[PDB]
């Protein structure tokens, strides 16, 4: 037996429903997201940290000329200088103090802490919703975790379970992102070479121990103006360490819809939005046949104070006759109502005090049970808190949000325009029979 | 000096230009896209390929009852069996020959051979673009890679080059790929999860030796029948055989615009369409004064037999009366006309031969020398060979192609009926004012 729901997607808060087979007693389905990941795809394009300024050792030919070759090692910079005269230790590292060129190298890696102090770059894209529902029938319970795109199926030992395609796409990733230690950054970056110095990303990589770097820190290199040996040398600040500094808030605390951004993988985990429609195929052992569960004569509905809000704060009570001893369902037919309880004994003859929330002025909603309705009518009052630590369990309607005083008031006040002009277009019509008449 | 060039995509062909500098003798350059590689952005779905359904051997309670549990192996099937009695080489295996439960057990694995024949379902994102770029200006050559997306730069030691972006984006993937063996499929495949029995991908895996297996074979154990213990089973074949069988044609020999796709990593190289926008900063020493190459004094064009082929199937001299020898550039300034030679030796008082091609029935094109212009107008005939293995050096232009025999015909039939018309026009005038006078 195949029941199609519309579940909505919000973590913790269950949704009830009652299936009726029709030769069959009516059962009870609860089902709760326990859990709910969405994963985008994810392919890492480069990796970059504050580079290490690697310079090695200076040459020099001491009475000749040497030429600065080429290499593919990341921002390979070298230059030559003529006479230098370098002095070491004891005074004097060069005979010809003329025609004494140098030469200057000076190239960038990563430095030995970036193994794990680096920023990880990504691009992102369509992101798919696998969620972990908790589905009660009957006298079952099972568990079951399963990817919401209405054709990856999940199965547990007799329940069969399609859910999906979520309602309203949503991914809380821009196009591109950074990772840094967990903390996940909405952040543009430049692409694969497309390398910009003094900014994010001035080096990139494949990985941390790559031999294939590109890097490009904007360095020159300057003569050397004093006695002593050495290779002096300016360099662009180190960008890595610029968006360190003006790297903002991460993504934990932006993403909207509350959903918990976590890393390896890349994913937000309870992510409530929207609804997500579900079809069970219920095993047919479950149900049971209506000669056997008590069928009830008749119920009458008494609602007892309530206040609409988030909490089971109204309450109501159900005058029952049955033939038998049981253990009826009970739901809520209505949109903006819900109940606590789902499955309550049942005598020959009594009374059974009930709980349940809503969000409209007025309870206008259609208790059911074991399949036999009535329709509940009531006045509930504001609540008294403002703020709640709890989160709203129906959602909030037009045409039942609105208080059947206020209704009769708009109604009386819109009615009274249009039969005024009923009353005006009957006398101009009585007025031109009787000139017709008359004429 | 900045020069701003639109070279077409089309590698092996070179493309000439003249950079002419306002004080400067004009410059020659050539522009050859040695290589081109558009390589997307992938990240493994998962691995599939033939699976081996392994059966583990049968247990047999004497006379108790087994029970079957839960497993995680890729599409576990597990099943029980009452009376069974089963024989060996014996022919009595249990005892109390009744109620002599069966336990029947299955899954499926990674063939041993999957290690090399195994398709890999990819996802393919937005390619960027790589070309390599030999760049010879007056005498100088260099060779470069650059990113084709108007950002990144390519620098060889005084060239700085800016290359992009392309000016219609083309990627030959579609949205998922699968690579076998080196071959590409543009095949979309189910979704991580989204096992179908019988078709690609109902066995799933993110690596060859991962445990997280994951299948749906839609494999049913069915009751032992025979006397001797053997557990039979039925199972769908297999999708990837099935897959393999109705692979189609690989990508190789239908990606458009022909180019070869490669593997490891996957890209498309030598694949032409479109044009780039490349901008060179050629370095200021490589420009000489006017001054110090011969300028000539007057030059004229005579054009000798010129056929629009694919090839340079066209021929004219050029008298010159000049200076001083020299190494004068040249060049045409016509997009339907280029040239086989990009500079000359030039004596003070003489004339040089020279070749072109063009795609136009008619020579209406400017050439070039030492920057002084001349105009070559001559009529060419259809080409003879109908077909070369040669690609065509430029485009036809928008009709451009007009020769002046129907340029003639069809404004002389056009122009007919404009003056007929302006003749009507002027009559009905005339005859107008001659009543009005006349009235």
Same mark, same amino acid.
């Given at each position: 037996?195949?029941?199609?729901?519309?579940?909505p997607?919000v973590?913790g808060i269950?949704?009830k429903?009652? %299936?009726?087979?029709?030769?069959?007693?009516?059962?009870?389905?609860?089902?709760?997201?326990?859990?709910?990941?969405?994963?985008?795809?994810?392919?890492?394009?480069?990796?970059?940290?504050?580079?290490?300024?690697?310079?090695?050792?200076?040459?020099?030919?001491?009475?000749?000329?040497?030429?600065?070759?080429?290499?593919?090692?990341?921002?390979?910079?070298?230059?030559?200088?003529?006479?230098?005269?370098?002095?070491?230790?004891?005074?004097?590292?060069?005979?010809?103090?003329?025609?004494?060129?140098?030469?200057?190298?000076?190239? %960038?890696?990563?430095?030995?802490?970036?193994?794990?102090?680096?920023?990880?770059?990504?691009?992102?894209?369509?992101?798919?919703?696998?969620?972990?529902?908790?589905? %009660?029938?009957?006298?079952?319970?099972?568990?079951?975790?399963?990817?919401?795109?209405?054709?990856?199926?999940?199965?547990?030992?007799?329940?069969?379970?399609?859910?999906?395609?979520?309602?309203?796409?949503?991914?809380?990733?821009?196009?591109?992102?950074?990772?840094?230690?967990?903390?996940?950054?909405?952040?543009?970056?430049?692409?694969?070479?497309?390398?910009?110095?003094?900014?994010?990303?001035?080096?990139?990589?494949?990985?941390?121990?790559?031999?294939?770097?590109?890097?490009?820190?904007?360095?020159?290199?300057?003569?050397?103006?004093?006695?002593?040996?050495?290779?002096?040398?300016?360099?662009?600040?180190?960008?890595?360490?610029?968006?360190?500094?003006?790297?903002?808030?991460?993504?934990?605390?932006?993403?909207?819809?509350?959903?918990?951004?976590?890393?390896?993988?890349?994913?937000?985990?309870?992510?409530a939005?929207?609804?997500?429609?579900?079809?069970?195929?219920?095993?047919?052992?479950?149900?049971?046949?209506?000669?056997?569960?008590?069928?009830?004569?008749?119920?009458?509905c008494t609602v007892a104070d309530c206040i609409y809000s988030a909490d089971f704060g109204g309450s109501l009570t159900?005058?029952?006759?049955?033939?038998?001893?049981?253990?009826?369902?009970?739901?809520s037919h209505s949109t903006t109502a819900v109940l606590k309880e789902?499955?309550?004994? %049942?005598?020959?003859?009594?009374?059974?005090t009930l709980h349940f929330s809503t969000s409209s002025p007025q309870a206008n909603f259609i208790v059911?049970?074991?399949?036999?309705?009535?329709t509940c009518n009531a006045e509930c009052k504001p609540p008294a808190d403002h703020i709640i630590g709890e989160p709203h369990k129906v959602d909030q309607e037009f045409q039942a949000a609105v208080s059947k005083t206020s209704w009769n008031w708009l109604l009386a006040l819109f009615?009274?325009?249009?039969?005024?002009?009923?009353?005006?277009?009957?006398?101009?019509?009585?007025?031109?029979?009787?000139?017709?008449?008359?004429?």
């Amino acid at each position: 037996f195949e029941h199609a729901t519309t579940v909505p997607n919000v973590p913790g808060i269950p949704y009830k429903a009652l %299936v009726e087979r029709a030769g069959y007693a009516p059962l009870n389905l609860e089902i709760t997201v326990v859990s709910s990941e969405l994963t985008p795809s994810t392919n890492k394009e480069y990796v970059t940290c504050r580079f290490h300024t690697v310079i090695p050792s200076p040459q020099v030919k001491c009475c000749g000329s040497l030429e600065c070759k080429a290499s593919s090692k990341a921002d390979y910079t070298c230059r030559v200088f003529g006479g230098v005269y370098p002095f070491m230790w004891g005074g004097a590292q060069c005979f010809c103090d003329s025609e004494n060129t140098q030469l200057s190298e000076a190239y %960038v890696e990563f430095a030995p802490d970036c193994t794990i102090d680096h920023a990880v770059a990504l691009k992102v894209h369509t992101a798919a919703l696998k969620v972990g529902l908790r589905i %009660v029938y009957g006298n079952t319970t099972a568990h079951l975790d399963t990817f919401v795109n209405g054709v990856t199926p999940g199965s547990s030992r007799d329940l069969k379970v399609i859910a999906g395609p979520i309602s309203a796409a949503f991914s809380p990733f821009d196009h591109k992102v950074v990772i840094r230690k967990g903390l996940v950054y909405n952040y543009d970056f430049p692409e694969y070479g497309a390398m910009k110095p003094g900014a994010f990303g001035d080096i990139q990589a494949s990985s941390l121990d790559a031999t294939d770097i590109v890097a490009r820190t904007d360095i020159r290199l300057l003569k050397p103006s004093v006695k002593n040996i050495h290779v002096p040398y300016t360099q662009a600040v180190s960008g890595y360490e610029m968006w360190k500094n003006n790297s903002g808030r991460p993504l934990q605390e932006t993403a909207p819809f509350g959903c918990k951004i976590e890393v390896e993988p890349l994913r937000a985990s309870n992510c409530a939005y929207g609804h997500i429609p579900i079809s069970i195929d219920i095993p047919d052992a479950a149900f049971v046949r209506s000669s056997e569960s008590p069928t009830i004569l008749e119920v009458s509905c008494t609602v007892a104070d309530c206040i609409y809000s988030a909490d089971f704060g109204g309450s109501l009570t159900l005058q029952y006759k049955a033939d038998r001893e049981g253990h009826c369902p009970v739901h809520s037919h209505s949109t903006t109502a819900v109940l606590k309880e789902a499955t309550t004994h %049942v005598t020959a003859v009594g009374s059974i005090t009930l709980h349940f929330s809503t969000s409209s002025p007025q309870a206008n909603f259609i208790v059911s049970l074991c399949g036999k309705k009535t329709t509940c009518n009531a006045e509930c009052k504001p609540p008294a808190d403002h703020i709640i630590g709890e989160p709203h369990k129906v959602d909030q309607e037009f045409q039942a949000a609105v208080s059947k005083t206020s209704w009769n008031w708009l109604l009386a006040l819109f009615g009274g325009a249009s039969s005024l002009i009923v009353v005006g277009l009957i006398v101009l019509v009585c007025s031109s029979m009787l000139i017709n008449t008359r004429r």
